[PDB]
Amino acid sequence: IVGGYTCGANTVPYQVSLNSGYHFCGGSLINSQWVVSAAHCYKSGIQVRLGEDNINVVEGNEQFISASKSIVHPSYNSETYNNDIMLIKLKSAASLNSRVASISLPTSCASAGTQCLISGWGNTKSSGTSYPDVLKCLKAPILSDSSCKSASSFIITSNMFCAGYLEGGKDACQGDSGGPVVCSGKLQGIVSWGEGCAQKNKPGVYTKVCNYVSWIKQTIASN
Numbered sequence: 001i002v003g004g005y006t007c008g009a010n011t012v013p014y015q016v017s018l019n020s021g022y023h024f025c026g027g028s029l030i031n032s033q034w035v036v037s038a039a040h041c042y043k044s045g046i047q048v049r050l051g052e053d054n055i056n057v058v059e060g061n062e063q064f065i066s067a068s069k070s071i072v073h074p075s076y077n078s079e080t081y082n083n084d085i086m087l088i089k090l091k092s093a094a095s096l097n098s099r100v101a102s103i104s105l106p107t108s109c110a111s112a113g114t115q116c117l118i119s120g121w122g123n124t125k126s127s128g129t130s131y132p133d134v135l136k137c138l139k140a141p142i143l144s145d146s147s148c149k150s151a152s153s154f155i156i157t158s159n160m161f162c163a164g165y166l167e168g169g170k171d172a173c174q175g176d177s178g179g180p181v182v183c184s185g186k187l188q189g190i191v192s193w194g195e196g197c198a199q200k201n202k203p204g205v206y207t208k209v210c211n212y213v214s215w216i217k218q219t220i221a222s223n
Contacts, residue, residue, distance in 0.1 A: 001118065002126050002198040003170035004138035009053040010061060012119045012135060014103035014187075015180060017049040018088075019064075026120045026179030028187055029102045032093040034220050035067075037178035038190050038207060039076040039086040046070065048090060051100045055121055056133045061099040065090045071219060073212070082157045084192045084207045086178075087219055105217075106186040109210035112144040116163060116183035118204075120191065122175025126168075126198040131175060138172070140164045142183065143203055151201040159211050161189065164203035172204045173197035181206050 016027040016035055025041035027048065035048055051061040068091040073083040094100055110116070118138045124130050140163045148154065148162035156162070163181060164171050172179065172191045181189030189206035196202060 001120055001122055001136035001138045001176055002124055002173050004136045007119060007135045007137035009059070010051060010099040012117070012137065013099055013101035015052070015119050015135060017052050017055055017121065018178060019047045019049050020045055023055050023121055023175070025177045026191065027088065028180040029094065029100070030105060030187070030216070031102050031220070032096055033090050035088045035090065036187070036190065036216065037086050037088060038084045038192055039072045040078065040081065040084055040192070041178040042070060042072050042086055046088065048088065050094055053135055054133045063094055063100060065092060065094060067091065069223070071223070073215070080155070080157070081193050082159055085190055085209070085212055087216065089223060103180060103182060103187045104185060105213050106188055106210040109208065110142055110183045110188045112142050114142050114183050115139055116142060116181050116188060118163070118172050118176070118179065118181050118191065120172060120176030120179040122177070123173040123197065126196070138170055140170060148203060152195070152203065154195070154205060156205065159208050160192065160205050161208050162203045162205055163189065166201055166203060168198050168200035168202070171198040
């Protein structure tokens with residue numbers, strides 16, 4: 001996260017870190033047995049780390065659980081990043097508490113102008129590389145599709161939405177992928193892609209979760 005702030009230990013209880021010997025993506029806990037992330041974060045042998053703040057220090061509230069199965073969206077297109085969403089089922093149910101909680105799925109889609117919270121352990125520099133060990137936070141608004149496309153020239157589908165500041169300076173970045181975008185208490189987006197980080201007229205692009213509620217619910221009910 002670029003231009004954000006230190007969230008504070010466990011203030012984002014649904015935030016998860018996907019670990020394959022090292023942190024490589026974020027994710028969101030939607031219930032005791034399931035986590036949602038981006039399809040481009042797919043990897044074999046994933047260990048889900050919940051209740052994390054400093055990812056390099058055992059602080060006492062962590063739960064390390066291996067993934068039993070991963071399901072990438074049936075129509076995920078790695079070239080355009082369309083349908084960039086994936087579900088991960090935990091080998092065992094997580095213990096829910098004040099530090100580890102689930103985030104609600106949306107009922108309706110969020111509209112332009114709505115403020116959202118984006119979090120992650122990704123790069124903090126727009127130019128250069130500097131990875132934080134503690135969770136970073138960023139409040140950013142949803143931009144209208146027209147405003148986004150006109151300014152960025154990005155090729156976006158109806159399964160994506162932009163959020164951020166056209167003036168630049170604040171944005172998600174590498175390492176934040178798969179992370180949550182929460183607006184009004186609901187998971188409305190997943191950190192998906194963009195052009196560089198925090199650049200002018202180049203806001204972040206996120207997977208529009210409200211378009212996948214049916215798939216998510218049906219998949220978890222049958223698995």
